[PDB]
Every structure is written in C-alpha cells, then in structure tokens.
Amino acid sequence: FMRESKTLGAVQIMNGLFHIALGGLLMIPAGIYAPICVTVWYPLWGGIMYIISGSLLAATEKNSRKCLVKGKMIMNSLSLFAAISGMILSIMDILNIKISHFLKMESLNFIRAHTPYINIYNCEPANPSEKNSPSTQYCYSIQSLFLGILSVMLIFAFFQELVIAGIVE
Amino acid sequence: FMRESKTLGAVQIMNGLFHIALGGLLMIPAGIYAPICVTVWYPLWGGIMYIISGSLLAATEKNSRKCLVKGKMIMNSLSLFAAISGMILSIMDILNIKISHFLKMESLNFIRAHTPYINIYNCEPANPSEKNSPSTQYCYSIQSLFLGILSVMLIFAFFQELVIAGIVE
C-alpha cells in the first residue's frame, strides 16, 4: 500500500541486487550457443536501473517540487517496460531450453574461445552406445539447472510485477 | 539503527527467501556426492527460521504485553545459533569443493536414481591422453559454477549477519 512506500525501496534495492546476482550467474561461459537472457546482458542493466530508481525513492519519500515525482513517474514507466521485457524474455527462453531452439543468438568472443566445442540445446549422442554416457547425465543435469534458474527468475519477475502493480496507484 | 528499525523486518523476510531460493537451487541432483550445504537440509529450516523471526518483528512495533519481546529474544538467540552453524558449514563446504573431500556425505536415493555415477571432486581420467574430453571441460565448468553460487551465498550470508548484528543491538 502507499502508506508503507518506505519499505518498498529496500525491496526494490534487494531486487536489483538479485538481478545482479542472476546476471553474474549467467555470465559463466558454458558453450557457444549461450542463452538469450545473457548475451543481451539484460539482468545487469535491469538491476542497476532498479537500484537507481529504488535508491532515489529510498531516502527522500517526501513532497518536493518537480524532479522527485517527475523522475518517479518516468522511472516507474521504465520499470514496467523492463518488467514486460523480462516476462517476454523468460517466456521465450523457457521454450528455447525445453523445445528446439530457433534463434541462434550468437555470443561474444572472450567467452566463446573458452568453451566453443559443446552444444547444450540438443546434446543427444548419435551412436546408441552412449545412452548411459557422462555427456547425457551431464546434459540432463544442465537442463535441470537452466530450468531451476529460469523458474526462480520467473517467480521473482512475477513478484516484482505484482508489487509494482500494487504500488503504481 | 533503531531510528528506522521498523523497516528491517522486510530485510529479514527477503533474506530468508534468498536462503530458500539458494537451497532450492542446490536441490538439483548434480553428481553422486551432493555438497554438505544440501545433504544436511540446512537451507530449508534456515529459511523457515528466518521467515518466522521476520514476520514477528514487523507486527506492531510497540511494547506488547509479554509474548513479543520474550520471543524476540529466544527466537533471536536461536537464529544466532543458526547463523554461526551456517558459517561453520560454509567454511567446511568451501574446503570440500576446493580440496579433496575428506568426508563422504552420500546423497539420497530418490534423486541419485537419475545421475548416480559422476563425481564432482576428481574428474581426472587415469590416462592423461584422454584429458581432451568433453566431460572435463564440463566438470571444470560445473566446478566454477558451484564456486560462484557458493561465493554469492557466502557474500549474502555475511551481509545478513552484518545487518543482524547491527540491528539486534
């Protein structure tokens, strides 16, 4: 509610830190065809924009002439755009990992040259002898790993959009 | 400080939620020997203890009859014990993941039933000629990823214990 607008800036700041954390966790160079939620570097600038728009609400929370509320509305519009962008991005990336990918989304050099040999989207060995092979127990683990990361990110994107929608009045 | 202690319960609640999320992410069946941070099932009861010691702080912020402050003490001390236990487990698990694990910690059956064979500590083939294999680019990548998750969990645990030690005064 608006009466407790003080305790939504700590929330926004922690949310920005959590976006920073998920971005840092995504930068790990595991394969050449990297997820689309990393090569676009969304979580970094999204978290930093949340952190500015939160820290600015944090320590003023009062009625000033123009900058305060004008910034507050442009930042809230920016945040809602960022939220719908993250929604669309997650709903495309879940499909990218659980259903055959369609967009290559080429990646950066400094991270390709480390692990340029492996595929993750469809790593099923051709010869049936490798059905009980490390490369597929490994692939099933890594698929579960993206599923867990993306499900937590999904849950938190809905929580942010929920409390934003509950504080836009 | 006390001047704004009424907005620390939200920090406690969110930090408990972060502990729950990291525990859920560690639940994934990655290898035969799961880390000690998940075999002891710490993060679950840790997050629940955090959430409960939170949702009592932000109740009324007044001097209740007897229930709020006596429990704010007993529940506070128990959370201190939990925090120092988490410290000890983390300083054990860093050595476990970056030095050869001296203790077993056999994982549970309903999860290993999918990937029961791979090891996460020593992915070194006997013959050095085979060292140019996918299963070790993979194991080094997983080791760096576990290192990153545990490092961010260490960071956030020091942050939560610092804010606690600051406010519980």
Epitope: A126, N127, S129, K131, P134 | Y117, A126, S133, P134, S135
Partner: antibody, heavy 118, light 113 residues
Framework: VQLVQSGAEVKKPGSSVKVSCKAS????????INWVRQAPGQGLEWMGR????????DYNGKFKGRVTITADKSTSTAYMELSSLRSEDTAVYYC????????????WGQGTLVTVSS | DIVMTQTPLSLPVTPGEPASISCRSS???????????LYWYLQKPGQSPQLLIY???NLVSGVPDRFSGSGSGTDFTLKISRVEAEDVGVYYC?????????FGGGTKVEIKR
C-alpha cells in the same frame, strides 16, 4: 588393463556354455559390456549387448531375443548363455569394454572358440 | 538389416607403391552434425582384432603414422602412405550411426611376390 576370458569348451548341440570375461584395472561398473562372435566364412556379427550398471540392453533384432544376459556385480564378471545351439553358432566369442568419448572398443579379450558338434 | 559390401574381397599388394581399400554404406551415413562416424578394425593372424583408424581421420597412440582415410559420405577410401610387410590381416569397416550396428565382410590383405 587386462581382459582375461574363460577357456575353450567343446559341447554338443542343445547344451549351454558360460564364459567369464573377467577384467581388472578399471571401473567395471562405469563401462558397457558387449559380446561379439566371429563365425568361419562370415565377417563379424553383433549379437547383443548389456549394461552391467542397471541392466540396460540393446538387441540387433535378427536373433529374436533368445539370448539371456546377466551380470554379477560381486565379482565384476559378465556371463553369456547360448541355448538351443545350432551348427551356425560355431564361432569365437569375445567380450569387450566400451570406453566412452570416441574410443569405442580399444581393449578386447582373446576370445573363446566354441565348436558345436554331435 | 543394412548390408555391408566390400570391393575387392582380396587384394595382393606389393611393398611401397599401392594402397587401396574401400567401404560404402547403403544409407549415406550422416547425422547432420558435420562429422561421419566410422571405425576401422584390424585382426592380425592368430590374435584379437585391433583398431587402426578411429573416426576415419585420426590415428591412435603407438600405431605408425603411415595410415590415412578419407571420403565424401557414401564412397570411402583407406590409404596407407607406405605399405609394409607387417600390416597383414582382415580390415573391417563399420557404422555406428544407428542400431543395429553392422560390420563389413572383410578384406584379406596379403603380400605380392
């Protein structure tokens, strides 16, 4: 690495043999186990395979499931059984360990020649 | 079943100059991954088979470098840079793209005199 196979046995049609393809020097449970025979006048023909870890199998299909494959984890010994022997089953039977990641079948046993005759 | 056919079944070779043996597949082995999976086995007289050429383009540790292989996807050639008097035996090609695995009929290489 060593793979030591059972000795040679001469039998009669309708009998059965149990060959022990015992090996040491590696993780037996971390490798596949296959049996392959070599009959005179024919090339090499795959008859089946076993995964000792959990009992997974693959069959060629030409031999309609008549073979029984088992595993003994207590001694890391695999066994091959051949019933209803026919003259066309005379061959040398080899066991072989699958090595993952490209090097399919580097180490092979010495083989056991089984001759079926009345 | 997929049938493997070799040509020729036997080839007397003379030291030095010639080296020629071919395999072909009836289904045009290709997994759309850019690599064609193959194996070459050698059975020396009186002992167990050994692998000479793995994935058709790489050699194993310890085998003399005088061995090579190439192809397009349906027609294949195994080349020996310098044939000697010790690489006797039956050479087998094989495919592992799909179950069931199949093996060639064998080519007996001998010395020409």
């Amino acid at each position: 690495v060593q793979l030591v196979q059972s000795g040679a046995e001469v039998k009669k049609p309708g009998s059965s043999v149990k060959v022990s393809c015992k090996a040491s020097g590696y993780a037996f449970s971390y490798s596949w186990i296959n049996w392959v025979r070599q009959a005179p006048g024919q090339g090499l023909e795959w008859m089946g395979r076993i995964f000792p870890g959990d009992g997974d199998t693959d069959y060629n299909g030409k031999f309609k499931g008549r073979v029984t494959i088992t595993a003994d984890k207590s001694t890391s010994t695999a066994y091959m059984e051949l019933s209803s022997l026919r003259s066309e089953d005379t061959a040398v039977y080899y066991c072989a360990r699958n090595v993952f990641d490209g090097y399919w079948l580097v180490y092979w046993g010495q083989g056991t020649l089984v001759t079926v005759s009345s | 079943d997929i049938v493997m056919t070799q040509t020729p079944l036997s080839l007397p070779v003379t030291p030095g100059e010639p080296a020629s043996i071919s395999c072909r597949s009836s289904k045009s082995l290709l997994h759309s991954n850019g690599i064609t999976y193959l194996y070459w086995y050698l059975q020396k007289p009186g002992q167990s088979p050994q692998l000479l050429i793995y994935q058709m383009s790489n050699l194993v540790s310890g085998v003399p470098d005088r061995f090579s292989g190439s192809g397009s996807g349906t027609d294949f050639t195994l080349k020996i840079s310098r044939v000697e008097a010790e690489d006797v035996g039956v050479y087998y090609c094989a495919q592992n793209l799909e179950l069931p695995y199949t093996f060639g009929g064998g080519t007996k290489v001998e010395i020409k005199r």
